[PDB]
Amino acid sequence: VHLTPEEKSAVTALWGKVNVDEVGGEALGRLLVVYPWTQRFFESFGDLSTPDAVMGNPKVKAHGKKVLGAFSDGLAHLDNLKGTFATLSELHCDKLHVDPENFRLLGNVLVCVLAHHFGKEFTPPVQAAYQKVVAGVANALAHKY
Amino acid sequence: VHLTPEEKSAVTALWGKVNVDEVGGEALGRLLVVYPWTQRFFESFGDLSTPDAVMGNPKVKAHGKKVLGAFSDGLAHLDNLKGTFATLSELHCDKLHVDPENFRLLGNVLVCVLAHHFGKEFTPPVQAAYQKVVAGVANALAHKY
Amino acid sequence: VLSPADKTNVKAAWGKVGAHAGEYGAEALERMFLSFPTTKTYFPHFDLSHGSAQVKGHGKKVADALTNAVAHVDDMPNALSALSDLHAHKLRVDPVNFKLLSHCLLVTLAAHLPAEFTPAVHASLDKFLASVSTVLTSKY
Amino acid sequence: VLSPADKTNVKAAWGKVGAHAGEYGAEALERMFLSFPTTKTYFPHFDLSHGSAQVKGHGKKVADALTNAVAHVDDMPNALSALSDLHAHKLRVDPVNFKLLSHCLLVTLAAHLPAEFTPAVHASLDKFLASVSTVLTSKY
Ligand code: HEM
Ligand code: HEM
Ligand code: HEM
Ligand code: HEM
Ligand SMILES: [Fe+3]
Ligand SMILES: [Fe+3]
């Protein structure tokens, strides 16, 4: 993904403010709630039985951090997302071989969560820069190495 | 796209039999008929007013050949589809900047047309190899250079 | 909503499938499994090899569910009620996979029924299978 | 089909938009135009700059169409009949673009209504806007 300096700045500035212990879990959690077939991919995570159980599940929350982790990595290596993410997908055997759409969905849910948290600071130009990144990351994580 | 030799053979063998003057026009035409919002992207092509007008339109038929043209190119350079297609998208200014989904749709319609034409020779393994290619080509043509 | 012509085009085409109803369902499943290998994860317990009796039987069930939908085309939410509950609520099938199977069903019909699969009937069949898919994903 | 709880969650949330109905519609359009620049091609004749009166007015129309849908949530095909004919048959909007605007509408609600946008209401709002989108793309 090619980001303009203004786009880069918009992303980076707000990313520094993110609660890295919570946002990721909130995004992953709402995916499971809003798009419930996604629970199947997290069979191993235990109790995903209600909005509150989902949102309170430790492995949810933990995997959230990782979601953020992967976003940051993408941010750090935007000209080489396939480079950045081959080991990430390869350590999972087949678990990231799902439709690219669900990575798109997670990206969009992350956007909704960043809007929720940041309110008017998550302006339309800042959203637009984030959509570029979530699109790039989704594609690379779908890629199959 | 990485194709196995058997996949490559399946694709290549049947591709040699294709009526290059007709198949492309048939695929492009059925896209316009089955998925009618696609007509908007071909505003410049004139009368697209009914299934028969669509299927009989000269610029449809002509652009069809090009569709095939681009598939062959993809086939010839599978390890470098972005290389192969940057000039193709760049000569169009903005006209290929549409959702990657419509390139997916065209690919699938091409598959339906190849099934129509080849009947039982378009076996499930041959279809599967073709889906790999149409997926690769769609992605690269969506890429924005 | 499906038009009177879609309904006619669907009944006419789906009425040449005939006693191959079964076989064509199987073929469409096979085509899905090979083209879109993610779909096999819903069937980790089936044997998915070519000629599998389990794919054959399941293919017949899928084809028969379609024929039930064709036969009650104005009341599909009601006719497919049990199956919508099954796929959406009970099995959690990713809605994307219905587009994949629908495409494979179109491919199979095009491979077997070259006369009937005109551009108009292709459009109608597409709309019908999308309508079915909508019903089958309505209960998440 | 939307549940009784979805209908409640939708009416409760969409009832805090309040007199910002208008402004929020505009914001969602702006967010769509900047994030998904292909969408601007449906509006080559609008001025799409920030603060545009044309985006503002159009934003109000879109918001008011949503409120009409909320107000007739059990009869949306009938209530949105004219608009489905407009977008699908008359304007030929790519169905993908409804997913994009729906996402932008969710983003806008999340940015303005942090209390109301719980995970349950987010799910309900998503389902509602998908229902609307289905109606608006039903007439191609
Ligand atoms: C889809 C279902 C997923 C499953 C079942 C899954 C499961 C696992 C497992 C079992 C590990 C090994 C280490 C451990 O047990 O903590 C792991 C590692 C990892 N996963 Fe996932 N994962 C999934 C999705 C994802 C996604 C979507 C991302 C990021 C976008 C992600 C990021 C990571 C990272 C970065 C590691 C490396 C170890 C670490 O940094 O903690 N995973 N995953
Ligand atoms: C979407 C709408 C499209 C429009 C309006 C359009 C229009 C054009 C125009 C005006 C030209 C210049 C040469 C001429 O006038 O014949 C051109 C060239 C070309 N187009 Fe397109 N095109 C479109 C889509 C596509 C697609 C989808 C493909 C292939 C996948 C394609 C392949 C080509 C090729 C290969 C050329 C180069 C000249 C040639 O080989 O004939 N075009 N196109
Ligand atoms: C046109 C679309 C579809 C129709 C009409 C349909 C129909 C059916 C029917 C009738 C059954 C019940 C079989 C029985 O009672 O033994 C069934 C079961 C099932 N369907 Fe579908 N189906 C469709 C799409 C899908 C898709 C897209 C998937 C997944 C990729 C899927 C996965 C399943 C599974 C996993 C079962 C249970 C299989 C078993 O364990 O026996 N279906 N379907
Ligand atoms: C939630 C989804 C939507 C709703 C409720 C909606 C509502 C409306 C309404 C009420 C109008 C009529 C305005 C008037 O009478 O002046 C309209 C017009 C229009 N809509 Fe939408 N719309 C939606 C989605 C879309 C999308 C996704 C696009 C394209 C990306 C689109 C493009 C248009 C255009 C081009 C017009 C004509 C604009 C003009 O020239 O004045 N709409 N829409
Ligand atoms: Fe994951
Ligand atoms: Fe084109």
Short mmCIF file of N, CA and C in Angstrom, two decimals, chain B residues 4-68:
data_model
loop_
_atom_site.label_atom_id
_atom_site.label_comp_id
_atom_site.label_asym_id
_atom_site.label_seq_id
_atom_site.Cartn_x
_atom_site.Cartn_y
_atom_site.Cartn_z
N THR B 4 0.15 -25.86 -10.42
CA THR B 4 0.81 -27.14 -10.55
C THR B 4 0.92 -27.41 -12.05
N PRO B 5 1.90 -28.26 -12.43
CA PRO B 5 1.90 -28.67 -13.82
C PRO B 5 0.62 -29.28 -14.32
N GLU B 6 -0.05 -30.14 -13.52
CA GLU B 6 -1.34 -30.67 -13.98
C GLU B 6 -2.36 -29.54 -14.18
N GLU B 7 -2.37 -28.57 -13.26
CA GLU B 7 -3.31 -27.43 -13.39
C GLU B 7 -3.00 -26.65 -14.65
N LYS B 8 -1.72 -26.37 -14.85
CA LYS B 8 -1.25 -25.66 -16.05
C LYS B 8 -1.67 -26.34 -17.32
N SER B 9 -1.49 -27.65 -17.34
CA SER B 9 -1.87 -28.47 -18.49
C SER B 9 -3.36 -28.39 -18.73
N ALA B 10 -4.15 -28.57 -17.66
CA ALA B 10 -5.63 -28.47 -17.78
C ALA B 10 -6.09 -27.13 -18.42
N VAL B 11 -5.48 -26.06 -17.96
CA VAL B 11 -5.80 -24.74 -18.47
C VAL B 11 -5.39 -24.57 -19.92
N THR B 12 -4.12 -24.82 -20.16
CA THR B 12 -3.51 -24.63 -21.47
C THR B 12 -4.13 -25.44 -22.54
N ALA B 13 -4.36 -26.73 -22.28
CA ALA B 13 -4.96 -27.61 -23.29
C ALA B 13 -6.30 -27.10 -23.79
N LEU B 14 -7.23 -26.85 -22.87
CA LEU B 14 -8.52 -26.37 -23.27
C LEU B 14 -8.48 -24.93 -23.85
N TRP B 15 -7.58 -24.09 -23.35
CA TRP B 15 -7.45 -22.71 -23.86
C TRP B 15 -7.12 -22.68 -25.37
N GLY B 16 -6.26 -23.59 -25.83
CA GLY B 16 -5.99 -23.73 -27.27
C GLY B 16 -7.18 -23.99 -28.19
N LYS B 17 -8.20 -24.67 -27.65
CA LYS B 17 -9.44 -24.91 -28.37
C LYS B 17 -10.41 -23.75 -28.41
N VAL B 18 -10.17 -22.68 -27.65
CA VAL B 18 -11.17 -21.64 -27.52
C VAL B 18 -11.37 -20.80 -28.78
N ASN B 19 -12.61 -20.59 -29.16
CA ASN B 19 -12.89 -19.64 -30.24
C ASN B 19 -12.61 -18.20 -29.74
N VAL B 20 -11.42 -17.71 -30.06
CA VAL B 20 -10.98 -16.42 -29.60
C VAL B 20 -11.77 -15.22 -30.14
N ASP B 21 -12.50 -15.41 -31.23
CA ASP B 21 -13.38 -14.33 -31.75
C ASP B 21 -14.75 -14.20 -31.05
N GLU B 22 -15.16 -15.22 -30.30
CA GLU B 22 -16.53 -15.30 -29.75
C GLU B 22 -16.57 -15.42 -28.23
N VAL B 23 -15.77 -16.29 -27.65
CA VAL B 23 -15.92 -16.56 -26.21
C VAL B 23 -15.86 -15.28 -25.37
N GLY B 24 -14.91 -14.41 -25.71
CA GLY B 24 -14.73 -13.20 -24.95
C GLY B 24 -15.94 -12.32 -24.99
N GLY B 25 -16.53 -12.16 -26.19
CA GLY B 25 -17.72 -11.40 -26.32
C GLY B 25 -18.91 -11.99 -25.59
N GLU B 26 -18.99 -13.31 -25.60
CA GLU B 26 -20.06 -14.01 -24.90
C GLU B 26 -19.94 -13.74 -23.38
N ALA B 27 -18.75 -13.82 -22.83
CA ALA B 27 -18.53 -13.59 -21.37
C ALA B 27 -18.85 -12.14 -20.97
N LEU B 28 -18.23 -11.22 -21.70
CA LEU B 28 -18.52 -9.80 -21.49
C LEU B 28 -20.00 -9.53 -21.65
N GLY B 29 -20.64 -10.09 -22.66
CA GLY B 29 -22.04 -9.89 -22.84
C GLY B 29 -22.92 -10.42 -21.69
N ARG B 30 -22.62 -11.63 -21.27
CA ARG B 30 -23.50 -12.21 -20.20
C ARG B 30 -23.32 -11.41 -18.92
N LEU B 31 -22.13 -10.86 -18.69
CA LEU B 31 -21.89 -9.97 -17.49
C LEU B 31 -22.84 -8.83 -17.51
N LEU B 32 -22.92 -8.17 -18.67
CA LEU B 32 -23.85 -7.08 -18.81
C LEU B 32 -25.28 -7.50 -18.63
N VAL B 33 -25.70 -8.69 -19.09
CA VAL B 33 -27.03 -9.16 -18.92
C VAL B 33 -27.37 -9.64 -17.48
N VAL B 34 -26.45 -10.39 -16.90
CA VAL B 34 -26.68 -11.06 -15.57
C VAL B 34 -26.50 -10.06 -14.44
N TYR B 35 -25.55 -9.15 -14.63
CA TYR B 35 -25.09 -8.13 -13.65
C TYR B 35 -25.15 -6.71 -14.30
N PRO B 36 -26.32 -6.18 -14.38
CA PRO B 36 -26.58 -5.01 -15.25
C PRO B 36 -25.99 -3.67 -14.87
N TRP B 37 -25.69 -3.48 -13.60
CA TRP B 37 -24.90 -2.33 -13.24
C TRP B 37 -23.58 -2.25 -13.97
N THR B 38 -23.10 -3.37 -14.57
CA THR B 38 -21.82 -3.34 -15.27
C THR B 38 -21.88 -2.51 -16.59
N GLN B 39 -23.09 -2.32 -17.09
CA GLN B 39 -23.35 -1.51 -18.30
C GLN B 39 -22.88 -0.05 -18.16
N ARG B 40 -22.97 0.42 -16.95
CA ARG B 40 -22.53 1.73 -16.65
C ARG B 40 -21.07 1.88 -16.98
N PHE B 41 -20.23 0.89 -16.64
CA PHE B 41 -18.81 0.98 -16.95
C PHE B 41 -18.52 1.01 -18.46
N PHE B 42 -19.47 0.47 -19.25
CA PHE B 42 -19.44 0.50 -20.72
C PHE B 42 -20.49 1.41 -21.37
N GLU B 43 -20.76 2.53 -20.70
CA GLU B 43 -21.48 3.73 -21.24
C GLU B 43 -21.14 4.04 -22.72
N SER B 44 -19.83 4.14 -23.00
CA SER B 44 -19.28 4.43 -24.34
C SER B 44 -19.61 3.41 -25.44
N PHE B 45 -19.97 2.17 -25.07
CA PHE B 45 -20.26 1.09 -26.05
C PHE B 45 -21.60 1.15 -26.81
N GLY B 46 -22.47 2.13 -26.52
CA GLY B 46 -23.70 2.29 -27.31
C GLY B 46 -24.83 1.38 -26.85
N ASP B 47 -25.53 0.72 -27.78
CA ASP B 47 -26.78 -0.01 -27.42
C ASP B 47 -26.59 -1.36 -26.65
N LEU B 48 -26.92 -1.28 -25.36
CA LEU B 48 -26.87 -2.40 -24.43
C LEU B 48 -28.27 -2.59 -23.84
N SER B 49 -29.31 -2.57 -24.68
CA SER B 49 -30.72 -2.42 -24.23
C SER B 49 -31.53 -3.69 -23.99
N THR B 50 -30.97 -4.85 -24.30
CA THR B 50 -31.69 -6.13 -24.18
C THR B 50 -30.66 -7.24 -24.28
N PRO B 51 -30.99 -8.46 -23.82
CA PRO B 51 -30.01 -9.54 -23.97
C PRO B 51 -29.42 -9.70 -25.38
N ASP B 52 -30.28 -9.70 -26.38
CA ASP B 52 -29.85 -9.77 -27.79
C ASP B 52 -29.02 -8.58 -28.27
N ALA B 53 -29.33 -7.35 -27.83
CA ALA B 53 -28.55 -6.17 -28.23
C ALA B 53 -27.17 -6.22 -27.63
N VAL B 54 -27.15 -6.63 -26.36
CA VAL B 54 -25.90 -6.78 -25.65
C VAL B 54 -25.01 -7.76 -26.40
N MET B 55 -25.58 -8.95 -26.64
CA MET B 55 -24.86 -10.11 -27.19
C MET B 55 -24.44 -9.84 -28.64
N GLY B 56 -25.18 -8.96 -29.34
CA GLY B 56 -24.85 -8.49 -30.72
C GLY B 56 -24.04 -7.20 -30.91
N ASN B 57 -23.63 -6.56 -29.81
CA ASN B 57 -22.96 -5.28 -29.86
C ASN B 57 -21.50 -5.48 -30.27
N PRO B 58 -21.04 -4.74 -31.31
CA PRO B 58 -19.72 -4.92 -31.87
C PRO B 58 -18.60 -4.61 -30.92
N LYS B 59 -18.74 -3.50 -30.17
CA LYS B 59 -17.69 -3.08 -29.23
C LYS B 59 -17.61 -4.08 -28.06
N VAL B 60 -18.76 -4.62 -27.67
CA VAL B 60 -18.82 -5.80 -26.72
C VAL B 60 -17.92 -6.94 -27.18
N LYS B 61 -18.27 -7.44 -28.37
CA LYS B 61 -17.54 -8.47 -29.03
C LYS B 61 -16.06 -8.14 -29.16
N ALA B 62 -15.74 -6.89 -29.53
CA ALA B 62 -14.37 -6.48 -29.69
C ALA B 62 -13.61 -6.44 -28.40
N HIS B 63 -14.22 -5.79 -27.41
CA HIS B 63 -13.62 -5.82 -26.07
C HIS B 63 -13.48 -7.21 -25.47
N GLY B 64 -14.37 -8.13 -25.86
CA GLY B 64 -14.24 -9.53 -25.53
C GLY B 64 -12.90 -10.11 -25.92
N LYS B 65 -12.48 -9.83 -27.18
CA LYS B 65 -11.23 -10.37 -27.65
C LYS B 65 -10.12 -9.96 -26.69
N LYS B 66 -10.21 -8.72 -26.23
CA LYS B 66 -9.22 -8.12 -25.36
C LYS B 66 -9.17 -8.78 -24.01
N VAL B 67 -10.37 -9.12 -23.48
CA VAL B 67 -10.56 -9.90 -22.28
C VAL B 67 -9.78 -11.19 -22.35
N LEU B 68 -10.03 -11.95 -23.42
CA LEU B 68 -9.20 -13.13 -23.73
C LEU B 68 -7.72 -12.80 -23.81
#
